[PDB]
Swiss-Prot record, chain A:
Homodimer. Disulfide bonds join 98-101, 141-163. PANTHER family: THIOL:DISULFIDE INTERCHANGE PROTEIN DSBC, THIOL:DISULFIDE INTERCHANGE PROTEIN DSBC-RELATED. Keywords: Disulfide bond, Periplasm, Redox-active center, Signal. PROSITE patterns: THIOREDOXIN_1 (PS00194), THIOREDOXIN_2 (PS51352). This is Thiol:disulfide interchange protein DsbC. Required for disulfide bond formation in some periplasmic proteins. Acts by transferring its disulfide bond to other proteins and is reduced in the process. DsbC is reoxidized by a yet uncharacterized protein. Also acts as a disulfide isomerase. GO terms for molecular function: disulfide oxidoreductase activity. It is found in: Periplasm. It comes from Escherichia coli O157:H7. Belongs to the thioredoxin family. DsbC subfamily. Residues 16-211 form the Thioredoxin domain.
Length: 215, 216
């Protein structure tokens, strides 16, 4: 029961963020300061994720699917480049100091034109004590985030700006989702697709992924 | 049901090596080329792991246990150089083409004199089919494995063989244990200590480690 899980977590000096159900009988999904963990109902066993549902045609990352709750929770903190005819919606962990992230951003109008809406979350590859984290902190805190992001990528004046957006939250989520390098795309089902793909290749990928997921 | 589990693994291009009931009801501990995975009896869900038994004072790594199980099965294939008076027993992943493995073997008398029993398993850094793997296969397939390893490390040839020994097994397990180079030392509890240490340093290290693990 919950008391057992809490006693086990407390023993390990872990602070439970919330106890959710798991697709496996006998255990729960637990998001903690240490991240997501699976723990048996009796609190006797812990299994580090991720957990995958492999009953279907393709493997689904259930941990990531669950984390989409935390991801969608950051929706207002995302820098969104809306496609006029939104046919696809992807969330991309980006680093303004990454050459490939610049290459992707430079073609944003093409992704948008192909019907792909891009939502950015910050991911400083160099960690929280880096120029990347400071620069993106200022971007996300700007009156106009899109303008600020476009400017910084173009190598312009990154106006000093502060707010309560914590890049550490974006970074932690990305790490938990399995983000290693940038850019990294997160799909609507939680699937992580690390890497850069030009507008055309990307569109086809998104079209095929979708076709081979719903049936 | 191992059956449904193997169908799931196959559809993922993953191969199983050993399947055992897990400490968690409705789950099994599966050793695969992708590491130790925890899969449900119906083969529908896979959890990466490791799994830890936290129903005690300190966490117990179930994955480490599964790996030690494989190591125990390999004891019958280890080349053992026993110390007259056995104070320590270490398992060493060695490569006959490795300069530090040459040195370690050349100092075997000293490790043994210092009470250290050394048990070898093969680990071709250059992978399977390499010249290293081929020669060790010949060594491990010989009547007297000790004499054959000695002869080879001495530059002499050994009566080749086609036995039941497959170096791929040692290699695969080494990889699963975290071995990346040679020589690599594996302690009784599964702790991997990569690298060469001369006899005296190795002895001090093992004594200190044993003291620390026993709280003395």
């Amino acid at each position: 029961d919950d008391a057992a899980i809490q006693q086990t977590l407390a023993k390990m000096g872990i602070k439970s963020s919330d106890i959710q159900p798991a697709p496996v009988a006998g255990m729960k999904t637990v998001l903690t300061n240490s991240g997501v963990l699976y723990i048996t109902d009796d609190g006797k066993h812990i299994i580090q994720g991720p957990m995958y549902d492999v009953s279907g045609t393709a493997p689904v990352n259930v941990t990531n699917k669950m984390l989409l709750k935390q991801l969608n929770a950051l929706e207002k903190e995302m820098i969104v480049y809306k496609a006029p005819q939104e046919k696809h919606v992807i969330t991309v962990f980006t680093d303004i100091t990454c050459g490939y992230s610049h290459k992707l951003h430079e073609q944003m109008a093409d992704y948008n034109a192909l019907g792909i809406t891009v939502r950015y979350l910050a991911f400083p590859r160099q960690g929280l004590d880096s120029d990347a984290e400071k620069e993106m902190k200022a971007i996300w805190c700007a009156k106009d985030k899109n303008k600020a992001f476009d400017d910084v990528m173009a190598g312009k004046s990154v106006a000093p700006a502060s707010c309560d957006v914590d890049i550490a939250d974006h970074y932690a989520l990305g790490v938990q989702l399995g983000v290693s390098g940038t850019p990294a795309v997160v799909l609507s089902n939680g699937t992580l697709v690390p890497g850069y793909q030009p507008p055309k290749e990307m569109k086809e990928f998104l079209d095929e992924h979708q076709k081979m997921t719903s049936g």
